[PDB]
Design an enzyme around this catalytic site. Structure first.
Site, PDB file in Angstrom:
ATOM      1  CD  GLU A  75      -3.369   0.138   1.965  1.00  0.00           C
ATOM      2  OE1 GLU A  75      -4.057  -0.891   1.755  1.00  0.00           O
ATOM      3  OE2 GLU A  75      -3.504   0.864   2.976  1.00  0.00           O
ATOM      4  CG  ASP A  90      -8.838   9.098   1.360  1.00  0.00           C
ATOM      5  OD1 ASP A  90      -9.858   9.622   0.850  1.00  0.00           O
ATOM      6  OD2 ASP A  90      -8.794   8.701   2.546  1.00  0.00           O
TER       7      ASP A  90
END
Ligand SMILES: [Cl-]
Ligand SMILES: [Cl-]
Ligand SMILES: [Cl-]
Ligand SMILES: [Cl-]
Ligand SMILES: [Mg+2]
Ligand SMILES: [Mg+2]
Ligand SMILES: [Mg+2]
Ligand SMILES: [Mg+2]
Ligand SMILES: [Mg+2]
Ligand SMILES: [Mg+2]
Ligand SMILES: [Zn+2]
Ligand SMILES: [Zn+2]
Ligand SMILES: [Zn+2]
Ligand SMILES: [Zn+2]
Lengths: 163, 163, 163
Positions: free
Chosen positions: B12, B21
């Protein structure tokens, strides 16, 4: 009589006299390479030295078994030096090891190491799951008769497909 | 050093300072959500309270590991409340549980519960059969690099794909 | 109450009075053949002799269970005479044997013996691997509702799909 020699006599065939292979050298028995190439006198010389008698270049079935059994010993030695094949080979019983050697004689160790998923299922004793997966390969499509017999051997650990 | 934190740092990524995000809030470390939204002062306030020091909004690798390890504890808690995931999770060893947590962080528990057949094979200790089945999924096609590493972890129960 | 009778009452249905089947004779209960053919008096005669009371031609649920349980005994006898099915049947528990009998009632023993790979995985206790493989069949595509219930039974060895 059923063993590894008879298994390959069925799958590959027996040649009791010298011949030429598909590109391209002198061979005898079940695929036993003599020399590369192209004089028949050099191959006939290699023959007599290997068996230990008079021949030019014709052998018996018992003599061919002697040559083949030396190839299996060299094949086993090859498999044991290969990190990709040694753990499978170690875990298998004698008859299932003969099926793996049969595959190595047909496609070589790089070709057999390509059967990763199936080899791992065999290691886990997932005989039936590996049989199903092995049948979904190009090897199976191109040589189904040989592949079916080899798969039955891996599945059962018996010589049933060859009797 | 190889553990669950390093595993997700690879899959990730790490962010040592505040960011936004994909639709759409303030985040830090390995995907640690701070607040929704859209003032950076509220997120910077949530940060200092969570770590227990001065920051605006930059952390260390050891501080990021502390945040991530709390997310794993909350994730484990989630999995244990799920009847579809609890029996698998219970049967697995610590490293295979890390592969299952990795999947939950990527797709959520409803997404992971969707892997019924493979999860059941894992429960039966059919590692190799589950590896083959997991590779035949949309998850594998869309993120093959991550999926291959996670599948090796489920297959071996070792950190080999991450070393 | 959950057993083999209730299982087939769900999958095939119950007929408490005489009827005709798809080409083409007199039947009662869960597919119990009376006679071939075509007089209803001969079928009504066979009925009374089989149950041991007055009827023309209507039975109870308890009487239908008696007829069905005799068919299962004859079916079990059939499976045990079949070399292709006897080893699977022997290895299974009572509930997984009911799933195999259900399949035999739907397609016959030649049809069930056709499920070789899956039957072998069941023999190896590879429940989940066999569930996945059974779902990839024409049987599954043509009768998915029945097939899903039978597959859950083979997977669990419980009556869960029928409760
Ligand atoms: Cl198996
Ligand atoms: Cl396996
Ligand atoms: Cl399984
Ligand atoms: Cl499988
Ligand atoms: Mg051997
Ligand atoms: Mg062939
Ligand atoms: Mg853990
Ligand atoms: Mg990827
Ligand atoms: Mg029974
Ligand atoms: Mg149906
Ligand atoms: Zn298996
Ligand atoms: Zn397996
Ligand atoms: Zn399995
Ligand atoms: Zn399997």
């Amino acid at each position: 009589p059923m063993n590894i020699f008879e298994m390959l006599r069925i799958d590959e065939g027996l040649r009791l006299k010298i011949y030429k292979d598909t590109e391209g050298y002198y061979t005898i028995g079940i695929g036993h390479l003599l020399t590369k190439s192209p004089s028949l006198n050099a191959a006939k010389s290699e023959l007599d030295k290997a068996i230990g008698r008079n021949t030019n270049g014709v052998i018996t079935k018992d003599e061919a078994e002697k040559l083949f059994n030396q190839d299996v010993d060299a094949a086993v030695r090859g498999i044991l030096r290969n990190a990709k094949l040694k753990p499978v080979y170690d875990s298998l019983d004698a008859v299932r090891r003969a099926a793996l050697i049969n595959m190595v004689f047909q496609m070589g160790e790089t070709g057999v190491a390509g059967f990763t998923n199936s080899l791992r299922m065999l290691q886990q004793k997932c005989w039936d799951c590996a049989a199903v997966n092995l049948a979904k390969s190009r090897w199976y499509n191109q040589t189904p008769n040989r592949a079916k017999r080899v798969i039955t051997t891996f599945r059962t650990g018996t010589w049933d497909a060859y009797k």
